[PDB]
PDB file of N, CA and C in Angstrom:
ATOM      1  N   UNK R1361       0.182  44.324 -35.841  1.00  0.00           N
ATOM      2  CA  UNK R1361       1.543  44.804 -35.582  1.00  0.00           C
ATOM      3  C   UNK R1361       1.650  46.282 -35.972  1.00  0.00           C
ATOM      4  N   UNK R1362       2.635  47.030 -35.529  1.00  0.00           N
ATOM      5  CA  UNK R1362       2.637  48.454 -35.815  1.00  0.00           C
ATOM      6  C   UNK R1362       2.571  48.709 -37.211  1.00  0.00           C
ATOM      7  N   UNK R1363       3.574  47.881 -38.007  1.00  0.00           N
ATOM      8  CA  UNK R1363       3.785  48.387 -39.405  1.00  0.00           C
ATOM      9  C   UNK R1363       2.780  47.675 -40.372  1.00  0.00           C
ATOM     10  N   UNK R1364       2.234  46.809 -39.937  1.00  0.00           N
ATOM     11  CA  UNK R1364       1.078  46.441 -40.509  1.00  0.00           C
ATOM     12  C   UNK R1364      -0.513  47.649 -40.351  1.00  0.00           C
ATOM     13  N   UNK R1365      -0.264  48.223 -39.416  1.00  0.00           N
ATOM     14  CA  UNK R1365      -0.729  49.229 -38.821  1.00  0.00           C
ATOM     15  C   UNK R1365      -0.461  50.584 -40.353  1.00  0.00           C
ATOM     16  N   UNK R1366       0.829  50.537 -40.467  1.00  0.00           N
ATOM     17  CA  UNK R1366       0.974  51.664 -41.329  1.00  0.00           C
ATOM     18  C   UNK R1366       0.554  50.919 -42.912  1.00  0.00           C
ATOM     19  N   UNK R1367      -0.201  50.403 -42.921  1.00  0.00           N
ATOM     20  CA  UNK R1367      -0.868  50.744 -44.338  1.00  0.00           C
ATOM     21  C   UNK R1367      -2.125  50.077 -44.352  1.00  0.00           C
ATOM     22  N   UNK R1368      -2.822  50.026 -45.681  1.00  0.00           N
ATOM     23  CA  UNK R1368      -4.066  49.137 -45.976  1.00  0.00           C
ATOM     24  C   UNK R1368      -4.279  49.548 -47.475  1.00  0.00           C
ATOM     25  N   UNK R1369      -4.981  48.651 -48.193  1.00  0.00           N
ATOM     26  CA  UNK R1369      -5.431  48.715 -48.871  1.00  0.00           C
ATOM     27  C   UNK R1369      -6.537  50.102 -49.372  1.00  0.00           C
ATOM     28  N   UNK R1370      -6.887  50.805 -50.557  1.00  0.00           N
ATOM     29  CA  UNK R1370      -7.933  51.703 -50.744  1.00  0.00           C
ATOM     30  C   UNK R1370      -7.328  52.327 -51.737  1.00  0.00           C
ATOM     31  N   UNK R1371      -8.692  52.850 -52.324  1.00  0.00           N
ATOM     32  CA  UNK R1371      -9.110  53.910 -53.892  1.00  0.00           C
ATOM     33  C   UNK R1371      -8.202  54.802 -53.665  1.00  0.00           C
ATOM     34  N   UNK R1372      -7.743  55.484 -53.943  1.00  0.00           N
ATOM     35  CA  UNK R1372      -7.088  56.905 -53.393  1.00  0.00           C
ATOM     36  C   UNK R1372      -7.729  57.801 -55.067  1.00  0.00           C
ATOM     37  N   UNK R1373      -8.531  58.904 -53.954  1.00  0.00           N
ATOM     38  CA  UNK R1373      -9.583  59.596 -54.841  1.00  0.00           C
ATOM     39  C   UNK R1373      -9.152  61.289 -54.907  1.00  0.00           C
ATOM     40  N   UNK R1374      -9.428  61.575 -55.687  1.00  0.00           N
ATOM     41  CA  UNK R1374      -9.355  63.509 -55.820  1.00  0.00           C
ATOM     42  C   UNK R1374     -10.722  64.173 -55.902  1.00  0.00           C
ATOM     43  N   UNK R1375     -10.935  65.119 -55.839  1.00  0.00           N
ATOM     44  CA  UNK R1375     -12.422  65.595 -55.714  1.00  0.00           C
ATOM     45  C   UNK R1375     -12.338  67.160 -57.028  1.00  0.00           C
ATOM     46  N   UNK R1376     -13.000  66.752 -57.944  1.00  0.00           N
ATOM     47  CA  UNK R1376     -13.017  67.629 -59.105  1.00  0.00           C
ATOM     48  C   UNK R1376     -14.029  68.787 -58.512  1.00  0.00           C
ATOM     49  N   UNK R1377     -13.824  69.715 -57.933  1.00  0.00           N
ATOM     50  CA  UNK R1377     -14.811  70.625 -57.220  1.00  0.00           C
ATOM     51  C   UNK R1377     -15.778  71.318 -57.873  1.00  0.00           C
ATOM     52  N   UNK R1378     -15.222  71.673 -59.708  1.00  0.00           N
ATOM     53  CA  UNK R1378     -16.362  72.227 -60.077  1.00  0.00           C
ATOM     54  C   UNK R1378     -17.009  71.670 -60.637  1.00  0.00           C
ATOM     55  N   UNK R1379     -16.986  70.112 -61.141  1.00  0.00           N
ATOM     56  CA  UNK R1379     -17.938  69.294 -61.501  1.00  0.00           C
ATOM     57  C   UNK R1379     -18.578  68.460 -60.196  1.00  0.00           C
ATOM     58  N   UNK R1380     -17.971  68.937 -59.224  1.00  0.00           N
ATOM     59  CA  UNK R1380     -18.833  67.795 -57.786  1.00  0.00           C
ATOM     60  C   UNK R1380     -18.879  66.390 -58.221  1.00  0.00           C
ATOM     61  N   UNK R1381     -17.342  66.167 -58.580  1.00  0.00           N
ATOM     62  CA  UNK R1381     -17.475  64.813 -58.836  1.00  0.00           C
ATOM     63  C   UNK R1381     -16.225  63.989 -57.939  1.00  0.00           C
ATOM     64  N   UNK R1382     -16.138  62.781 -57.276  1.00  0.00           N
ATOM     65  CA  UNK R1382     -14.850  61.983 -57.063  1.00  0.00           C
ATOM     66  C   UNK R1382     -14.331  61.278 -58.367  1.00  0.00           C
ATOM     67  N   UNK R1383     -12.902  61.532 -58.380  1.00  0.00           N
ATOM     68  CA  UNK R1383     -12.393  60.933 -59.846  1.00  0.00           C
ATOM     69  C   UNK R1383     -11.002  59.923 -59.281  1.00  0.00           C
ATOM     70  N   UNK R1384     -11.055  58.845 -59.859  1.00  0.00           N
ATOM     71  CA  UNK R1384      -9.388  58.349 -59.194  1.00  0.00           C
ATOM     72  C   UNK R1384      -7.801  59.332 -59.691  1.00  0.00           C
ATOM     73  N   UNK R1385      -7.488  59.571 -58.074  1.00  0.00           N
ATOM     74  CA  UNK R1385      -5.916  59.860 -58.610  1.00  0.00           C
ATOM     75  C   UNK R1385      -5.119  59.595 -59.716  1.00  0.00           C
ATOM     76  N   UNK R1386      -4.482  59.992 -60.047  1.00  0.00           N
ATOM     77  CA  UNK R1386      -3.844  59.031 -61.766  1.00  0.00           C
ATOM     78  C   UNK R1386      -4.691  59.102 -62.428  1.00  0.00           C
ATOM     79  N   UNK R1387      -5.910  59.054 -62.404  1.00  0.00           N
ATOM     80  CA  UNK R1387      -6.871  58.982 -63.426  1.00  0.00           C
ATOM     81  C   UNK R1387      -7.455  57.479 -63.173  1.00  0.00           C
ATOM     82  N   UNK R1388      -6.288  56.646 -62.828  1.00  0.00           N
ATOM     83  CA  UNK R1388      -6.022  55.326 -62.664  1.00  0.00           C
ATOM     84  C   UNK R1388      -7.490  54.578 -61.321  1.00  0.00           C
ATOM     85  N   UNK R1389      -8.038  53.690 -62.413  1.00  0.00           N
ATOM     86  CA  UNK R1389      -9.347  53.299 -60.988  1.00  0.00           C
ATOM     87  C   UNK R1389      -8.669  52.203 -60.678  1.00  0.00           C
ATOM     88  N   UNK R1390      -9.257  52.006 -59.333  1.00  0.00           N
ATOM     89  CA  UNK R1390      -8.778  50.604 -58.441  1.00  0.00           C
ATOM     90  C   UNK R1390      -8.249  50.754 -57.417  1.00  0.00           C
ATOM     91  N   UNK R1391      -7.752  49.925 -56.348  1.00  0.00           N
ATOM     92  CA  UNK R1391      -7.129  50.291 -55.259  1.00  0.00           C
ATOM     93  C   UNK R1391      -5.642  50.181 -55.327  1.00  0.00           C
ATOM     94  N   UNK R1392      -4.793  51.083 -54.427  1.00  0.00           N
ATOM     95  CA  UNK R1392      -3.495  51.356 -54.029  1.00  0.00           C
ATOM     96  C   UNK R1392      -3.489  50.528 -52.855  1.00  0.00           C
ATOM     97  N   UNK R1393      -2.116  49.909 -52.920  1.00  0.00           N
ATOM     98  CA  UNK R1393      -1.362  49.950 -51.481  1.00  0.00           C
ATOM     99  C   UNK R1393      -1.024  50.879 -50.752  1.00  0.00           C
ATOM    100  N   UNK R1394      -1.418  52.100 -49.519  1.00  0.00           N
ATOM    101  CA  UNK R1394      -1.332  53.291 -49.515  1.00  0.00           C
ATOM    102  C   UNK R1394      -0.211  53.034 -48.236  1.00  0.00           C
ATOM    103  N   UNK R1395       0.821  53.340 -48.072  1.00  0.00           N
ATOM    104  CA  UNK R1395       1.318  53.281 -47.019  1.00  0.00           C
ATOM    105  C   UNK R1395       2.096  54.636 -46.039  1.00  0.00           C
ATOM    106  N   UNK R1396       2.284  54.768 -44.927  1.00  0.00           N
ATOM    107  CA  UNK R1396       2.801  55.944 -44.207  1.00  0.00           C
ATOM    108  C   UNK R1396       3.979  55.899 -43.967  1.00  0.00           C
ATOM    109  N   UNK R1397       4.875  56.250 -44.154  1.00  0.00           N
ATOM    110  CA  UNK R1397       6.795  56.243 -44.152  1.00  0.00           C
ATOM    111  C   UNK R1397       7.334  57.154 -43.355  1.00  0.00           C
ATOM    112  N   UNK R1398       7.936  56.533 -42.020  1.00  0.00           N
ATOM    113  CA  UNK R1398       8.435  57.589 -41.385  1.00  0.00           C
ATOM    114  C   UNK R1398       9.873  58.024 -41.933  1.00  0.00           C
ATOM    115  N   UNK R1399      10.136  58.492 -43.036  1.00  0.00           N
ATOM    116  CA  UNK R1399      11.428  59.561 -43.172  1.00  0.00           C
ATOM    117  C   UNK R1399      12.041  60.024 -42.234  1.00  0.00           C
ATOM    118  N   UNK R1400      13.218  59.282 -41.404  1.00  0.00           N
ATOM    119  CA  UNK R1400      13.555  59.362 -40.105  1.00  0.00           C
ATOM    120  C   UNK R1400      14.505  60.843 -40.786  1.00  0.00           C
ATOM    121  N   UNK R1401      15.304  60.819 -41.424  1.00  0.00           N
ATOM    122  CA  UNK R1401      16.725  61.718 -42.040  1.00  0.00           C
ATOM    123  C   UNK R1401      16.083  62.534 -41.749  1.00  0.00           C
ATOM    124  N   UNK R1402      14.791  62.689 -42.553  1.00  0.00           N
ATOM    125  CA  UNK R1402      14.491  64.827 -41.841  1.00  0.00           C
ATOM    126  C   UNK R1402      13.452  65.020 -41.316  1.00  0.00           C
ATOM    127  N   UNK R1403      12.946  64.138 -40.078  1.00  0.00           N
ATOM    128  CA  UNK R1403      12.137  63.978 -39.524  1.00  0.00           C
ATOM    129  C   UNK R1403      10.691  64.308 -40.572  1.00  0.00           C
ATOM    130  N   UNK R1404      10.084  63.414 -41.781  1.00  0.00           N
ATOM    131  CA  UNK R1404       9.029  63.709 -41.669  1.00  0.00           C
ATOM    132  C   UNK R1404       7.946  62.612 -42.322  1.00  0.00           C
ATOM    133  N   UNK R1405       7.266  62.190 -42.245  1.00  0.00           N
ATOM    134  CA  UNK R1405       6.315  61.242 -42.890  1.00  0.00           C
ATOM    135  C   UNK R1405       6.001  61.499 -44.411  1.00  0.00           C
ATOM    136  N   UNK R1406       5.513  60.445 -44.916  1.00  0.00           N
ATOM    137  CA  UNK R1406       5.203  60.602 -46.052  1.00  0.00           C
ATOM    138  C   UNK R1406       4.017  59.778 -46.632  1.00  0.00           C
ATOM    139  N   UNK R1407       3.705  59.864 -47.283  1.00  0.00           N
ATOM    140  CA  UNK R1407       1.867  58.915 -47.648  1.00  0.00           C
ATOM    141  C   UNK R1407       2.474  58.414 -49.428  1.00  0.00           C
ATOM    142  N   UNK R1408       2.339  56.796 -49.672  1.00  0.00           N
ATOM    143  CA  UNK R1408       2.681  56.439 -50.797  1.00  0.00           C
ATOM    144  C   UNK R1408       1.953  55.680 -51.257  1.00  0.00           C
ATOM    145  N   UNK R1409       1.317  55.615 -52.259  1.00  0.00           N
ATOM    146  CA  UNK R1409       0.511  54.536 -52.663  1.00  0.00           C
ATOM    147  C   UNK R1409       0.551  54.422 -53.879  1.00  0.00           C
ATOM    148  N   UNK R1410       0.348  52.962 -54.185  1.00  0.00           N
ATOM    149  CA  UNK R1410       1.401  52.147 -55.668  1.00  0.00           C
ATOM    150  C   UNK R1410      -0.125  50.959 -55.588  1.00  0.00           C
ATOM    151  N   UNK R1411      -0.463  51.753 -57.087  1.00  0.00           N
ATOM    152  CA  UNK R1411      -2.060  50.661 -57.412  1.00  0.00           C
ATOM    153  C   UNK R1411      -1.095  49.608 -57.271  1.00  0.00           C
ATOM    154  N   UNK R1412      -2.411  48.436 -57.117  1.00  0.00           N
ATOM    155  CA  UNK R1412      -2.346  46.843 -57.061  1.00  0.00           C
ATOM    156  C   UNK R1412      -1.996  46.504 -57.997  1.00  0.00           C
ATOM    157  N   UNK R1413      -2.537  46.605 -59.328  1.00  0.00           N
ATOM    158  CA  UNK R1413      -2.337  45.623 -60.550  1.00  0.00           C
ATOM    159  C   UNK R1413      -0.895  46.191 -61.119  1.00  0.00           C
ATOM    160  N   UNK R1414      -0.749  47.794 -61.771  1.00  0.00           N
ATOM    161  CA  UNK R1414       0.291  48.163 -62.283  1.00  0.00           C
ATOM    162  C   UNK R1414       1.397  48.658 -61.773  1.00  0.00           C
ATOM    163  N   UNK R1415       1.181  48.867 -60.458  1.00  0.00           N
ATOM    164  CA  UNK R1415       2.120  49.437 -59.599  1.00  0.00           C
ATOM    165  C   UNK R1415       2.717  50.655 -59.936  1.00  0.00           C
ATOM    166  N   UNK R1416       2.146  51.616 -60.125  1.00  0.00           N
ATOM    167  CA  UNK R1416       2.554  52.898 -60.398  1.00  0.00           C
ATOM    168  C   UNK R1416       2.044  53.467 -59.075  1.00  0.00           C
ATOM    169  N   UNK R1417       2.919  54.543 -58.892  1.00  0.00           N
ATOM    170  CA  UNK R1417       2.350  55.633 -57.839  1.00  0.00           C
ATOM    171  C   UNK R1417       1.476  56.422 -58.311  1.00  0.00           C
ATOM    172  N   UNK R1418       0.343  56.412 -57.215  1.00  0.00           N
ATOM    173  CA  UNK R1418      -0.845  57.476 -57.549  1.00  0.00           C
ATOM    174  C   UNK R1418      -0.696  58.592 -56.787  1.00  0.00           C
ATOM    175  N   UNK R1419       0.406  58.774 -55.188  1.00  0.00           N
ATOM    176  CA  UNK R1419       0.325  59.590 -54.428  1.00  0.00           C
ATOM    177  C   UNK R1419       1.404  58.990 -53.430  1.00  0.00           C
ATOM    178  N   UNK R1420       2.368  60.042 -53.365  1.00  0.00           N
ATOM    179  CA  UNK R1420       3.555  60.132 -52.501  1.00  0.00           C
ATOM    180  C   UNK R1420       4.255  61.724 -52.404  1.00  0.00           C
ATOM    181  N   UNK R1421       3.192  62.171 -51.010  1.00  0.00           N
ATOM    182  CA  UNK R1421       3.381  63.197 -50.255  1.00  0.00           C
ATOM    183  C   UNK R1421       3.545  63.347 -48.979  1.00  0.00           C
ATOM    184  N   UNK R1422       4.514  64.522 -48.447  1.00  0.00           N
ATOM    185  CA  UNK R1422       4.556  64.739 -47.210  1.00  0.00           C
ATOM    186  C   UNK R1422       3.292  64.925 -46.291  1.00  0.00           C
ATOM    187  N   UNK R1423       3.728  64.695 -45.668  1.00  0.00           N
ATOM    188  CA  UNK R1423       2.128  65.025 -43.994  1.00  0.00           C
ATOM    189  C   UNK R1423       2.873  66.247 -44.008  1.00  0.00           C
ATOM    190  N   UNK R1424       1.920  67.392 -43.988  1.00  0.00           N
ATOM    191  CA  UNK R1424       2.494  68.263 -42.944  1.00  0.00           C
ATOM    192  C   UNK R1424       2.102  68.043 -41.627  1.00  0.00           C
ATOM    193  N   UNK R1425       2.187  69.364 -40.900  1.00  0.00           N
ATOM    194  CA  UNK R1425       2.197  68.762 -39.374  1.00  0.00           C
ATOM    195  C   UNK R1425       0.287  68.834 -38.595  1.00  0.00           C
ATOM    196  N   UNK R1426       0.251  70.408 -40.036  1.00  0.00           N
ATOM    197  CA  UNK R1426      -1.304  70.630 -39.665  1.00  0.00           C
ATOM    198  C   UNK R1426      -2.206  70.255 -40.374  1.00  0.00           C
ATOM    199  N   UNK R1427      -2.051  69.072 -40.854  1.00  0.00           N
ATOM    200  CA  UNK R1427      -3.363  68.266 -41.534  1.00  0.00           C
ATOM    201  C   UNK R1427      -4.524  67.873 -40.849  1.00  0.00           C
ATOM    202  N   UNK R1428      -5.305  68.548 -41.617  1.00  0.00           N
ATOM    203  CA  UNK R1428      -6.421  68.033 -40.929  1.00  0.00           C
ATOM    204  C   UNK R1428      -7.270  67.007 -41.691  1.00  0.00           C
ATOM    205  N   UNK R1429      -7.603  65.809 -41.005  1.00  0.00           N
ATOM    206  CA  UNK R1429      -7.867  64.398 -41.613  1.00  0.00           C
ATOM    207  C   UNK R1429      -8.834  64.152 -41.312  1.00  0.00           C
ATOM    208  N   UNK R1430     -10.042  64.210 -42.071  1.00  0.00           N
ATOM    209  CA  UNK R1430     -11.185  63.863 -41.616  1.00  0.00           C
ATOM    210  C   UNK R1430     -11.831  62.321 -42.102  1.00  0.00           C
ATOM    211  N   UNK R1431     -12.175  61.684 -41.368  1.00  0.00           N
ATOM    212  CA  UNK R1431     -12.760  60.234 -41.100  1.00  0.00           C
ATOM    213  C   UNK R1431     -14.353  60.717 -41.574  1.00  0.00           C
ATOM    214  N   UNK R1432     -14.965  61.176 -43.159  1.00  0.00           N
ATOM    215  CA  UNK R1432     -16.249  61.358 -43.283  1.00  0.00           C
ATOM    216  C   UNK R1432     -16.921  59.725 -42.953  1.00  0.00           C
ATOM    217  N   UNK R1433     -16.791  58.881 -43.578  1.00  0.00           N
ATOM    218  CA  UNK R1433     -17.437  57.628 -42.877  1.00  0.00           C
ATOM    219  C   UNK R1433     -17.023  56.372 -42.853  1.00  0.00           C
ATOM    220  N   UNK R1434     -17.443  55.664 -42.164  1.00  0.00           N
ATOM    221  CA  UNK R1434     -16.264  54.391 -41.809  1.00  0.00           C
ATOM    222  C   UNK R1434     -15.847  54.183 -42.486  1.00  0.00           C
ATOM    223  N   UNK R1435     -15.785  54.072 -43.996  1.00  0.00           N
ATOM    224  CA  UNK R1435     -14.833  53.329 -44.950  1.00  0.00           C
ATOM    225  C   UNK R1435     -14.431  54.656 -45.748  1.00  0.00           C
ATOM    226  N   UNK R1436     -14.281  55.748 -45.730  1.00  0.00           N
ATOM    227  CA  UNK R1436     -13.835  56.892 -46.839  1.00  0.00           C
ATOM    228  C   UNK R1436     -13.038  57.896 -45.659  1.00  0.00           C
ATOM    229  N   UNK R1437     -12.120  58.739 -45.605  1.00  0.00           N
ATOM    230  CA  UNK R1437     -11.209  59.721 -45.390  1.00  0.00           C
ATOM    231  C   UNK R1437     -11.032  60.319 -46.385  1.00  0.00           C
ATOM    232  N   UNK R1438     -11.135  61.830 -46.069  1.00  0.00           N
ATOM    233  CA  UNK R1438     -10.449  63.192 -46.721  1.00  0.00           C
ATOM    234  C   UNK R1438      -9.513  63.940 -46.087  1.00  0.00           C
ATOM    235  N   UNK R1439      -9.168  64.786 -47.350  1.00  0.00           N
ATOM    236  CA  UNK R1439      -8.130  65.624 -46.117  1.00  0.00           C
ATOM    237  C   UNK R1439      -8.029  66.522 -47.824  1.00  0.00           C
ATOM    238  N   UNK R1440      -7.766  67.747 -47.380  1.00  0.00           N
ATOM    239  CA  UNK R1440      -7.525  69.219 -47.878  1.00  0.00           C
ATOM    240  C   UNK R1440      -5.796  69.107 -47.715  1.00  0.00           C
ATOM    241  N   UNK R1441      -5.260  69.627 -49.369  1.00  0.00           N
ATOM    242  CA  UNK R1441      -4.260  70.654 -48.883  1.00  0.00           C
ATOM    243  C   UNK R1441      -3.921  71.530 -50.259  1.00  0.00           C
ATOM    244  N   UNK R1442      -3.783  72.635 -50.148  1.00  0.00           N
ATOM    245  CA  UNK R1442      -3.786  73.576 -51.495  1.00  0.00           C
ATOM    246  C   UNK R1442      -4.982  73.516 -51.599  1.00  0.00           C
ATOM    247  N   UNK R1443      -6.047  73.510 -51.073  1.00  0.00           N
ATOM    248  CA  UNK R1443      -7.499  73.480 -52.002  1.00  0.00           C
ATOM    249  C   UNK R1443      -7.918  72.060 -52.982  1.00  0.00           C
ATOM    250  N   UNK R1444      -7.335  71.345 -52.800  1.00  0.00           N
ATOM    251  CA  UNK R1444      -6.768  70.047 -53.710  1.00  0.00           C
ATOM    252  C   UNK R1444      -7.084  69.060 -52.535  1.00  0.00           C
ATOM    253  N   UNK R1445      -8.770  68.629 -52.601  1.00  0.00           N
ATOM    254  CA  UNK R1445      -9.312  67.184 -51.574  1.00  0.00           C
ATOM    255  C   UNK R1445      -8.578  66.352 -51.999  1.00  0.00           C
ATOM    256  N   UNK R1446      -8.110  65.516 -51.178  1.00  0.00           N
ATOM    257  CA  UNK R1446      -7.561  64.097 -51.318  1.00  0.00           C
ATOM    258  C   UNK R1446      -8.613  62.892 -50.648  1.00  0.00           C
ATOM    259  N   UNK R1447      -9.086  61.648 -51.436  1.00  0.00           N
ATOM    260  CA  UNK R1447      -9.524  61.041 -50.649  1.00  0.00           C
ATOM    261  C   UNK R1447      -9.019  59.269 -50.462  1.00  0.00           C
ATOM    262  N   UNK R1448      -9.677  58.579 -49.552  1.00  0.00           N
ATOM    263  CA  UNK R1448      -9.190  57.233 -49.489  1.00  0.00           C
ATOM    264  C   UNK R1448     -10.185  56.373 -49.172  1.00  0.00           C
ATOM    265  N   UNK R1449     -11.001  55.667 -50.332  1.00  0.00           N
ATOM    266  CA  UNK R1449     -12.065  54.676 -50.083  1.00  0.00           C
ATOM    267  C   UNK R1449     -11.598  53.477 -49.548  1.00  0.00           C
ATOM    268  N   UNK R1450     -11.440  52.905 -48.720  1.00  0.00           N
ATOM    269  CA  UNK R1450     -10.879  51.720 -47.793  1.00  0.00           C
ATOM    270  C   UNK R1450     -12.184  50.569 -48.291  1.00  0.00           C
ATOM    271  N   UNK R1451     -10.839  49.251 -48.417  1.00  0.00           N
ATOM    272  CA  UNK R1451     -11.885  47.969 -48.451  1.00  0.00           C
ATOM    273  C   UNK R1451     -13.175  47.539 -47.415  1.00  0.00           C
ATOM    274  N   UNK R1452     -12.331  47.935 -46.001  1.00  0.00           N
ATOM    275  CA  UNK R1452     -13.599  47.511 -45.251  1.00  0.00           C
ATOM    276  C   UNK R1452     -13.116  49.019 -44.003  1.00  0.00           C
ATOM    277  N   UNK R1453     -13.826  48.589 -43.250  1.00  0.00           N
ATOM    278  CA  UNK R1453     -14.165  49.427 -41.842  1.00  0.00           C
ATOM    279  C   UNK R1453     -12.400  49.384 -40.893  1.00  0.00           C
ATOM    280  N   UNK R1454     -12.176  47.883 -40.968  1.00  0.00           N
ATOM    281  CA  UNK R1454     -11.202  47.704 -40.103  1.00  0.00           C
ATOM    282  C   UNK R1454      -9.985  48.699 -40.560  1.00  0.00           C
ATOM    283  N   UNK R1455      -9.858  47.941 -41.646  1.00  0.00           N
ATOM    284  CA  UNK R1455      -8.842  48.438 -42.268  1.00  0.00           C
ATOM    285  C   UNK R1455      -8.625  50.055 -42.390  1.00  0.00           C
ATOM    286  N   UNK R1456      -9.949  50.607 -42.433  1.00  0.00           N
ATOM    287  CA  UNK R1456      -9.869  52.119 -42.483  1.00  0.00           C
ATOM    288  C   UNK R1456      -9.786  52.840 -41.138  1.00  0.00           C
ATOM    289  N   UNK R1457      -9.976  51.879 -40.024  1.00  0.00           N
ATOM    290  CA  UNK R1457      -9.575  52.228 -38.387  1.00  0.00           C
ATOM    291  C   UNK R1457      -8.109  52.559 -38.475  1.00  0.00           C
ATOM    292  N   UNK R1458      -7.452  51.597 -38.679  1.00  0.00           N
ATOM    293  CA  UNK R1458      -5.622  50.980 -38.757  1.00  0.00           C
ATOM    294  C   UNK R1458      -5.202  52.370 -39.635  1.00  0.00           C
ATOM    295  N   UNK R1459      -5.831  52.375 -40.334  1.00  0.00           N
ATOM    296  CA  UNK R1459      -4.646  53.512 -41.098  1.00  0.00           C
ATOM    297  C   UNK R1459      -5.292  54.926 -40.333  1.00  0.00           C
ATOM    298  N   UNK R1460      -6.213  54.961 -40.502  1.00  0.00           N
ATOM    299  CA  UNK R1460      -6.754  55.999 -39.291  1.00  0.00           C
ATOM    300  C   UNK R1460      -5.415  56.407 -37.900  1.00  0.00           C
ATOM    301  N   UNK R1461      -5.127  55.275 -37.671  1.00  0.00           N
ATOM    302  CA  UNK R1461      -5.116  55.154 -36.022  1.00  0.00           C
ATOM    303  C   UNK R1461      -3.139  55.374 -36.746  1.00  0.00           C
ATOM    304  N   UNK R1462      -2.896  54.952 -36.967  1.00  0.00           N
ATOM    305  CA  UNK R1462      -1.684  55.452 -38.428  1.00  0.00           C
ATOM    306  C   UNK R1462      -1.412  57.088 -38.638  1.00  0.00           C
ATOM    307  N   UNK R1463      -2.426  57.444 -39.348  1.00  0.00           N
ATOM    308  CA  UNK R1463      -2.257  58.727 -39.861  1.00  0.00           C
ATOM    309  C   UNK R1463      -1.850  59.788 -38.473  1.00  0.00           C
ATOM    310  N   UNK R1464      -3.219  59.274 -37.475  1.00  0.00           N
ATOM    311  CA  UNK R1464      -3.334  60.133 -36.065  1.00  0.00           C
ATOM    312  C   UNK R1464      -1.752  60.447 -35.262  1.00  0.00           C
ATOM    313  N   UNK R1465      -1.134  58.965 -35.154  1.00  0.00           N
ATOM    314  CA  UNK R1465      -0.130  59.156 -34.839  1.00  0.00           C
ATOM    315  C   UNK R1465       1.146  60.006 -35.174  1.00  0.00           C
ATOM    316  N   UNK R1466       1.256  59.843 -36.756  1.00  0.00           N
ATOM    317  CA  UNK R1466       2.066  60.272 -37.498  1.00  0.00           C
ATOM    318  C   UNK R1466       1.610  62.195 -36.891  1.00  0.00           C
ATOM    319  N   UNK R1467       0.838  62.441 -37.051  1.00  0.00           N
ATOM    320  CA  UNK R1467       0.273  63.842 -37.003  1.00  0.00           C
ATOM    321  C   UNK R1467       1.060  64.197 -35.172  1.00  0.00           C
ATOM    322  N   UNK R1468       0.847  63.085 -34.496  1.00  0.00           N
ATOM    323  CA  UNK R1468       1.104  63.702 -32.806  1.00  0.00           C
ATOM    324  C   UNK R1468       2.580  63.724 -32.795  1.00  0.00           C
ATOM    325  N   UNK R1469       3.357  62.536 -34.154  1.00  0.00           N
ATOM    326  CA  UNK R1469       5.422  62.957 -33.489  1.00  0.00           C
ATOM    327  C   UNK R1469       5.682  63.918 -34.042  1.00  0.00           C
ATOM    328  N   UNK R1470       4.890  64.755 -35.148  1.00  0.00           N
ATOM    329  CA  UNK R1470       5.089  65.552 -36.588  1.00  0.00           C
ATOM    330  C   UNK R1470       4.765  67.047 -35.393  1.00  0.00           C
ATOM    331  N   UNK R1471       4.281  66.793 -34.087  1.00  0.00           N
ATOM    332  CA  UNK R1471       3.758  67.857 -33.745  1.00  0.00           C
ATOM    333  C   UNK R1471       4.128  68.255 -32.387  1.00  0.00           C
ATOM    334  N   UNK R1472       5.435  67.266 -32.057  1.00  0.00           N
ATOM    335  CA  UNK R1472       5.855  67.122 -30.436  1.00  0.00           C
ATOM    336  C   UNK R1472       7.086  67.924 -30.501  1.00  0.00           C
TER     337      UNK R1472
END
């Protein structure tokens, strides 16, 4: 379904650049519920994700319009903004299609 479409399960990771290391967001390891929110009021999306066990937010930010989202391999996505990698280790393949196919969209109404 569409809105099943807007989320999935996954790590949501940061990239410590001068140690070349991936570290979890929050600090917090484990997976988020990461989901995409269309913010109809001022036209704009948003990315939220609330770990599994404690439910805290690790990450709830706007899309801008020129994100660029890269799919490095079937189960991991990055994306740059401020110089500040963001990443998203996905449970399986599928699941990292769906939010894929999610994000893409969000990027084409953010840009019409």
């Amino acid at each position: 379904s569409e809105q099943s479409i807007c989320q999935a399960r996954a790590a949501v990771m940061v990239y410590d650049d001068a140690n070349k290391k991936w570290v979890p967001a929050g600090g917090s390891t484990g997976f988020s519920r990461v989901h995409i929110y269309h913010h109809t009021g001022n036209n704009t999306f948003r990315v939220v994700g609330r770990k599994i066990q404690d439910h805290q937010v690790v990450i709830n930010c706007a899309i801008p319009k020129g994100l660029k989202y890269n799919q490095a391999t079937q189960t991991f996505h990055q994306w740059r903004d401020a110089r500040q990698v963001y990443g998203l280790n996905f449970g399986s393949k599928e699941d990292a299609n769906v939010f894929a196919s999610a994000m893409m969209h969000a990027l084409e109404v953010l840009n019409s």
